[PDB]
Structures are given as structure tokens and as C-alpha cells.
């Protein structure tokens, strides 16, 4: 248009094979480095000096067991920059101390910021409301709390999840054994939103496909399915039914997104070990009365079994020499 | 010339003017589901502890016996019963019936019959209303998951004590014991189920945000936009081309599901197939076809075992297993 800023603005918003925009200056390099850094780590970089594990394709791992493992516990919450005082420019030592994890997590953090900015930018360019950006704040809150806020409250980056399939599976059982994360009401609200979102996806797609009108042309001014028939069906099957199409689609937004946001609030509490581990009255009752036993008390026994049997190898920086007599067993109870 | 009583009964049962449609499938659904509902409520509020293990150590599950809503459950049947049919009339006393976990068998069997009849009832109302009959196929996936978790896993393991308890903490206990014994997390079918549930939430939020974003202006300022849609209207309530252009520019030039029919088919199909596969994974793990075992997969030149993340997962499974196998 007028100035040099206007030509750059016109070039970035030009209709090409992939939209760039101003957010693409932040999204495209950060997302490419995070994904490229993750693919580099699962292929070549080991976790031998941080976890005592082999976690790369070079060492014999497959796609399920390879991971970009977290830094060593001695690193603390260091940013672990390549030029930082830990690696001092040595990229080989940087890979061995787990600096690739902070590389993927930090560039991935600015990647999801750039993607949400991209959602805002395209919505303003097309001219629609920015509800996709609000819906993406759910995954942003989950990524920020789990991969950044939770290790920042813990001892080090070591206790964050590692970028891998089986490594994430360990992180699930770690938070169950150490925090009783299933008993947290914030995770329960998260399960309700995520399972409810899958229900809403299945039930809405089936209803539209089955209340279809006998005739989708892209420029169809009329609706392709009968809302009256769909409302009549679910009112007699379930008792209640949607009657507003706009409320039905806000609800499809709200339920899974609120599940991500509610579970993220509990992870923040888990960062400071403010966990919902026990019911004190039920724990006191089982102490005085050994015959007393509920499913919650049986679960706390399994949490003790998780903690003591993994701690020797899950946290190798600490020695944790546990003899067989102190290892909890249901047999010798 | 007068109408027979059976004709009036058939006209009332299959009537579409009832507030809740009954139908012939509902003739099985309503008494079974109301039986299981009242029995579950009574057993949840007040029921003596059930000796699930079979060795005279009972587990309390009712509110009146010292547990809350989270820890409350209808404890599964005793290990002495196994997969034996245990109705209330085959027990010597009501006290012995409640001691052996009979309420679990009653509630589970009536609930299973009720949800199968619910599938049939969904088809029935779809038939009476003149619509396409595949909502029941979509509901067949959570029904399959419930069947695998309540009936089929006890069949494979040989005891209804191994079924999922009808409670929250009991559900978590079932999940932990199942992971310890079968490694469901490393099963490919549970991966397909997690992909189905995660993707279903993604696609639900995505579709909802896309429709909510492109709503056509019909209301005044700060008034609720939901009044812009009229129930029974023919015209579209949102701008489909604007949402398609946004979704196209979001990822790559032409990616929007331009045909809304296949978009909604994909929405209805993805979590249903995922839940089908995770139900079949749970059902196949009942017969000891466990998940992937990548234990001791990396060794050095001298034969020493280098652990992977699967080894740490196995250590967690072993801890849960040794705390579950009470004097094996």
C-alpha cells in the first residue's frame, strides 16, 4: 500500500499454497525446530547419561519406546541453552545432559503461541469470530501446565514428561503412584470433558447423517438435516434434546475445552504436591480398624507398590537401595 | 367390530405421541433399567461389606458403612461364586446373598439387558420417525465397552469378581489391576481407543468452534446469539463458505471438508471405531492376549541389559502386580 510495512503485510497475507501471516514468522521456525528436534532426538540422541536409558533408534529402540528424555536432575530448572554454562557450546555434551528436551519444550511453547496467533490472524483475515483460538487455549493450557508448570514446581525438569510414547505411559503411572492423580476431582472433570467431547462428536455426527434430507452442495442455503426430527428423536429416546443449532455447537466447543482447562488446574496443584492423595477420615478408620477396607484404601496400597518398585530405576540419580523386605507386597502384608 | 385389547396395546406401545417412546424394545428396557437403578441406589446407600476375595476379608462399598461418593461402590461378586449364576433365591439367606456380592450380579445383568434393549429402542424410534437407522450402531460402541468391562472380562478370567466395580475408586482399582496384569497401555487397541477419544474431543471442539465462529448476524448487541436460530427454520444458521475458507487457510490450501455429509460421517465414525477397537482390546486381553512386550529389548555387547522406558513401565506394572497378588 503506502509504506514498507504495508508491502510486507500484503506479502505475508497473500493467498499462496500455505498462509504465512505475521504469526508465521514465529510459528514456522519454532514449530519446525520443535518437530525437527524431536525427530532428531528419537533417532540419534540417547538418555544414558540422564536417565540410564536407551531411547533412540540408534540404540535399538522402536517408535513406541524411543523418546526425547528430560534433562538430568542435577540440571535443576536450567534453561540448558547450547551456549549456557552447562554445555558451553559443545553440542555433544548438550545432547548428553538432556538439552534437547528444553530445546523441544521451549520451541514447542513458542510454536503453540504462534499457532494460536495464526488462528487469530486468519480469523481476522477471513472475517469470522475467533472461537477456534479460544478452543485451542485448551491444548495450550494442557501443554503449559504439564510440560512447563509441573516440572517448575517439582525439583527439576527431570520429572516432566519425556517426549515419547512409552515415556508418556510412565508419566501416567508416575502421577498415579505418587500423586493419586485419578482421585483428583480436577482430573475427573477432565475425563468428563474429554469423554463427553468424544460422545458429542459421535452422537452429533450420527444424528446429522441419520436425520438427513432426501436430496451437500457447497452453496446450499438450506440445511441438509432435519432439526425437528432430530429433536423429536432424542426427546423420546433420552428425555431431552437440542433445539438450538447454535447452542449445540457452542456445547461441542465447551465440553472438551473445559475438560482441558479443569484438568490443567489440578496439574498446577500437583506441581506443588497439593494432591488429592487421601481421605483422612477413611485413612484414620483403617488404621484403628484393620478389618475396614474400601476400594480407595486398596488403591493407596497399589500407589505404594508403584512408588517403591519404580523409584530405583525411575529416579537413578538418587541411590534408592531398597532391600526386598522393605519392598511392599500383598503377600507379606 | 370393536378393537381388540391387543390392538390398543400395540397402538399405545408403538405410539410416537408418548413423552418417552416405549416400543417393544422398551418393554424390555424400562423394567430392567428401573430394576438395576433402584437396586444400585439401595446397594450404594446401604449394603453390608462384600467378601470379594473369598477369604473372609470383606470390602465396604456403601455410604452407611463409612465411605463417601468417591470411594463408594457396588463391590463385585465373591471369588467363591466365580461365573456361577447367583440370583437372590439361590442364596440361603439375604445376609449371605449380600455377603457374596449378589447385588453386583443383579445390577450388572439387568443393566446389560437394558442397554441392549436401548440400542434396539433407538433403532425402533428411528423407524417410527422415518429416519435412517444408524444411531444405534454408534451407540453399539459404548455398549460393547461396557460388555467387555462387565461381562466378557469376567468370562475370560473365570470370575465376576474380576469385573469392574460399580464405583469411582473401584473403576480406578480395576484400571490399575488390569494394567498390572495385561499392560493395556502398550496394547495397540487401547492406543486406537485413546486416539479415538482424543480425536473425538479434538473434532468436536474444532467443528463447534468453526460453526460458532461463522454464525450469521441475526440478533442485537450483547443479546445471546442463540436467539438468531429459529427452531424449525430452513435457512442455514452459519456461513459455511467463511468457515471452510478459514479451515483451508489454517492448515493447507484445500483441506476443508467441503461436503458436510462426509464431515459429519467422519465425526460420527472416528470415536465409534476407536471405542470399538478399545472394547475389543479389553475383551481380547481377557483371554491373555496382552499388549506389546518390549522388555529387555536393548542389550550391550557384553550382554548387560540397558533399560528403556518400557522397562520403567514394567517396573510400575510389577509393583502393582505384587501388591495385588495377595499370597499367590
Amino acid at each position: 500500500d503506502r509504506g514498507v510495512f504495508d508491502l510486507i503485510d500484503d506479502w505475508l497475507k497473500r493467498d499462496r499454497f500455505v498462509f504465512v501471516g505475521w504469526s508465521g514468522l514465529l510459528l514456522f521456525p519454532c514449530a519446525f525446530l520443535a518437530v525437527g528436534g524431536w525427530l532428531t532426538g528419537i533417532t540419534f540422541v540417547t538418555s544414558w547419561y540422564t536417565h540410564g536409558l536407551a531411547s533412540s533408534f540408534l540404540e535399538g529402540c522402536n517408535f513406541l519406546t524411543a523418546a526425547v528424555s528430560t534433562p538430568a536432575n542435577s540440571m535443576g530448572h536450567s534453561l540448558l541453552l547450547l551456549w549456557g554454562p552447562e554445555a558451553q557450546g559443545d553440542i555433544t555434551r548438550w545432547f548428553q545432559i538432556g538439552g534437547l528436551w528444553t530445546f523441544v519444550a521451549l520451541h514447542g511453547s513458542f510454536g503453540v503461541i504462534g499457532f494460536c496467533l495464526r488462528q487469530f490472524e486468519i480469523a481476522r483475515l477471513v472475517g469470522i469470530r475467533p472461537y477456534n483460538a479460544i478452543a485451542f487455549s485448551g491444548p495450550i493450557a494442557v501443554f503449559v501446565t504439564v510440560f512447563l508448570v509441573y516440572p517448575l514446581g517439582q525439583a527439576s525438569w527431570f520429572f516432566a514428561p519425556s517426549f515419547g510414547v512409552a515415556a508418556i505411559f510412565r508419566f501416567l503411572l508416575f502421577l498415579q503412584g505418587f500423586h493419586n492423580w485419578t482421585l483428583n476431582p480436577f482430573h475427573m472433570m477432565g475425563v468428563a470433558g474429554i469423554l463427553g467431547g468424544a460422545l458429542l462428536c459421535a452422537i452429533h455426527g450420527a444424528t446429522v447423517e441419520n436425520t438427513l434430507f432426501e436430496d451437500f452442495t457447497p452453496t446450499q442455503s438450506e440445511e441438509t438435516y432435519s432439526m425437528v426430527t432430530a429433536n423429536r428423536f432424542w426427546s423420546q429416546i433420552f428425555g431431552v434434546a437440542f433445539s438450538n443449532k447454535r447452542w449445540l455447537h457452542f456445547f461441542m466447543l465447551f465440553v472438551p475445552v473445559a475438560g482441558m482447562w479443569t484438568s490443567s488446574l489440578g496439574i498446577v496443584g500437583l506441581a506443588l504436591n497439593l494432591r488429592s492423595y487421601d481421605f483422612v477420615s477413611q485413612e484414620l478408620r483403617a488404621a484403628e480398624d484393620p478389618e475396614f477396607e474400601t476400594f480407595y484404601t486398596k488403591n493407596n496400597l497399589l500407589n505404594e507398590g508403584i512408588r517403591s518398585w519404580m523409584a530405583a530405576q525411575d529416579q537413578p540419580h538418587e541411590n534408592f537401595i531398597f532391600p526386598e523386605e522393605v519392598l511392599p507386597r500383598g503377600n507379606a502384608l | 367390530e370393536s378393537a381388540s385389547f391387543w390392538e390398543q396395546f400395540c397402538a399405545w406401545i408403538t405410539s410416537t405421541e408418548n413423552r418417552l417412546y416405549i416400543g417393544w424394545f422398551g418393554c424390555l428396557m424400562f423394567p430392567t433399567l428401573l430394576t438395576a437403578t433402584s437396586a444400585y441406589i439401595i446397594a450404594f446407600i446401604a449394603a453390608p461389606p462384600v467378601d470379594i476375595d473369598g477369604i473372609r476379608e470383606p470390602v465396604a462399598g456403601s455410604l452407611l458403612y463409612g465411605n463417601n461418593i468417591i470411594s463408594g461402590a457396588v463391590v463385585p461378586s465373591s471369588n467363591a461364586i466365580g461365573v456361577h449364576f447367583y440370583p437372590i433365591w439361590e442364596a440361603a439367606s439375604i445376609d449371605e446373598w449380600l455377603y457374596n456380592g449378589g447385588p453386583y450380579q443383579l445390577v450388572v445383568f439387568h443393566f446389560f439387558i437394558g442397554v441392549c434393549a436401548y440400542i434396539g429402542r433407538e433403532w425402533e424410534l428411528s423407524y417410527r420417525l422415518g429416519m435412517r437407522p444408524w444411531i444405534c450402531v454408534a451407540f453399539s460402541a459404548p455398549v460393547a465397552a461396557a460388555a467387555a468391562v462387565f461381562v466378557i472380562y469376567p468370562i475370560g478370567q473365570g470370575s465376576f469378581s474380576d469385573g469392574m466395580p460399580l464405583g469411582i475408586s473401584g473403576t480406578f482399582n480395576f484400571m490399575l489391576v488390569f494394567q498390572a496384569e495385561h499392560n493395556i497401555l502398550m496394547h495397540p487397541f487401547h492406543m486406537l481407543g485413546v486416539a479415538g477419544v482424543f480425536g473425538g474431543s479434538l473434532f468436536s471442539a474444532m467443528h463447534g468452534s468453526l460453526v460458532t465462529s461463522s454464525l450469521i448476524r441475526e440478533t442485537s448487541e450483547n443479546e445471546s446469539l442463540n436467539y438468531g436460530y429459529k427452531f424449525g427454520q430452513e435457512e442455514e444458521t452459519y456461513n459455511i463458505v467463511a468457515a471452510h475458507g478459514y479451515f483451508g487457510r489454517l492448515i493447507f490450501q484445500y483441506a476443508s471438508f467441503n461436503n458436510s455429509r462426509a464431515l459429519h460421517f467422519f465425526l460420527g465414525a472416528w470415536p465409534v471405531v476407536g471405542i470399538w477397537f478399545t472394547a475389543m482390546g479389553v475383551a481380547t486381553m481377557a483371554f491373555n492376549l496382552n499388549g506389546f512386550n518390549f522388555n529387555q529389548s536393548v542389550v550391550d555387547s557384553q550382554g548387560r541389559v540397558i533399560n528403556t522406558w518400557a522397562d520403567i513401565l514394567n517396573r510400575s506394572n510389577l509393583g502393582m502386580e505384587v501388591m495385588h497378588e495377595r499370597n499367590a
Partner: peptide
């Protein structure tokens, strides 16, 4: 964390004030 969500919501309502009652039908 909850105030990060409010920033996204109120930031979107500012930059999209003209279209927040809905968009054109064309």
C-alpha cells in the same frame, strides 16, 4: 492460568468487536 484465558477472550472481543454479533450471510 485462568487470567491467561481471560486475556485471549477479551483480546479477541476487542479486535473482533465489529463481527462479534455475527457475520454476513454472503
Amino acid at each position: 492460568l485462568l487470567f491467561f484465558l481471560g486475556h485471549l477472550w477479551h483480546g479477541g472481543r476487542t479486535l473482533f468487536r465489529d463481527v462479534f454479533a455475527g457475520i454476513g450471510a454472503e
